[PDB]
Amino acid sequence: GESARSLGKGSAPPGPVPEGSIRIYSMRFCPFAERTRLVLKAKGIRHEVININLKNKPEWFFKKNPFGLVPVLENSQGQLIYESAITCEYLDEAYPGKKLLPDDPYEKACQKMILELFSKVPSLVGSFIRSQNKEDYAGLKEEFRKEFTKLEEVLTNKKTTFFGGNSISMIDYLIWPWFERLEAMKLNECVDHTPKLKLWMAAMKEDPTVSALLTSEKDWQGFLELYLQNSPEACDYGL
Amino acid sequence: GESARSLGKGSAPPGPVPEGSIRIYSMRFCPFAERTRLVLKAKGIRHEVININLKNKPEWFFKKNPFGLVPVLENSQGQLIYESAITCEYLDEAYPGKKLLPDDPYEKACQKMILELFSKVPSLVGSFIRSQNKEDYAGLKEEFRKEFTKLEEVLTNKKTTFFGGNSISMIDYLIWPWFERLEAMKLNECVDHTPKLKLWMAAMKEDPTVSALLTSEKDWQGFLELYLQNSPEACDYGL
Numbered sequence A, B: 001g002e003s004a005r006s007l008g009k010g011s012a013p014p015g016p017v018p019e020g021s022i023r024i025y026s027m028r029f030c031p032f033a034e035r036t037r038l039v040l041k042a043k044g045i046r047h048e049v050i051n052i053n054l055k056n057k058p059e060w061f062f063k064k065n066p067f068g069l070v071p072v073l074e075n076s077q078g079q080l081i082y083e084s085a086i087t088c089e090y091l092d093e094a095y096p097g098k099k100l101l102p103d104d105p106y107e108k109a110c111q112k113m114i115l116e117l118f119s120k121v122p123s124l125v126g127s128f129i130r131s132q133n134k135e136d137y138a139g140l141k142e143e144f145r146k147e148f149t150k151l152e153e154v155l156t157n158k159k160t161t162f163f164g165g166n167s168i169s170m171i172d173y174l175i176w177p178w179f180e181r182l183e184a185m186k187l188n189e190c191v192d193h194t195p196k197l198k199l200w201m202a203a204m205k206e207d208p209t210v211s212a213l214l215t216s217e218k219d220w221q222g223f224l225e226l227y228l229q230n231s232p233e234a235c236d237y238g239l
């Protein structure tokens, strides 16, 4: 729908969040905000979405988050929560349904330590934007392969389908958005020496939550070409 | 005591952690490891300490933490936990006594969002090491002042003694080590336009846990001059 169109500079500040719902301030192609949206879907949390034009931001958005970044949660009480991992943790704790983080303190620390193993991967997206030719591409693929070997080791040791066990859990949703984008970045071959990680991607794409939120390669390319041309229209690609 | 002397290259791998105790692999001047040690003291957790010579590390230490970094917790069951904030969270959850993180999901997310406001400050220690003259020092003081204004705003809004309320809590211990070191780095004047932050430092130094772990300026300078000369003896300064 046009209902998903972003609010940008000059938009009216939105009204209060209705009792019984939580609001996410998101952007449809942002992988950090996708984390929060995977959790909202996986736990069956009633919510509304406000997309932000990250090239043409409303000044009122800095009242939601002084950093000016998505995702942000806002509840009916007016409380604001930001930073992707903090939003996810908050939702798992505040709402009923599937516990995505273990109750056991050690197993919960393990999920966070895996998140730490992953922590170099997002900054590699800036690396991808600065890659201009085949030489830069070869070096970019090597950087992805050395982070991916760290994740392969965890699956080798656990011999589980997923990073937190045989059931999908929080850590899987927290890293998935970057794996979702590998095909579109032409980095799919970075998982070819990481066989368990490659099977984990196939298992993720079968998860009902993942499948319900997955964006096509054509849609992510439309976004990236406008985001790279510096277009105020990038966030609204397709609408 | 000489009992605190670091284990370095060639040391024997240590034995199992006794039932009823947890072990921290630490270094006496590392502010990340100090986080974990403030939590261990604040909750009254029985523990042993193994100091690591971070200039002359035992090869067995990479079996504790593949990153080779302190702090690491090891319990009687053989479980290993690393990354400073993860160790602290784990201890607050796994042990009885003073809850340092709130039970309320929102108030817990607030502490983590403040931690995020602080997240540039530790990398400013590398900035300090690279500062060579009065011009670099002036620029370094400005960088500290812009991060400190973000923390001042939180105290202005809450009008509480501490970052999590009127009682000291986890977030205060998580940021204190860097404030402890400001005098020794000659950055004490970076809090002079942040009056609540300056009163918060005076309140911290009165906390029994903080006071019990505080290192003198003379001791931190002895460490830093050896750490800067690249000395294998830096971590054992004073012993």
Ligand SMILES: *CC(=O)Nc1ccc(Cl)c(S(=O)(=O)N2CCOCC2)c1
Pocket (backbone or CB within 6 Å): A027, A029, A030, A031, A032, A033, A070, A071, A122, A125, A126, A129, A224, A227
């Ligand atoms: C919400 C959002 O998109 N945040 C964000 C911040 C930095 C980076 Cl690099 C990204 S990205 O990695 O999705 N990136 C892909 C290449 O250019 C567009 C953004 C996202």
Ligand SMILES: *CC(=O)Nc1ccc(Cl)c(S(=O)(=O)N2CCOCC2)c1
Pocket (backbone or CB within 6 Å): B027, B029, B030, B031, B032, B033, B070, B071, B122, B125, B126, B129, B224, B227
């Ligand atoms: C455990 C440890 O000390 N980690 C660590 C990592 C990086 C930096 Cl920069 C520090 S520091 O900021 O304490 N630093 C002070 C100046 O030089 C010595 C180390 C600590």
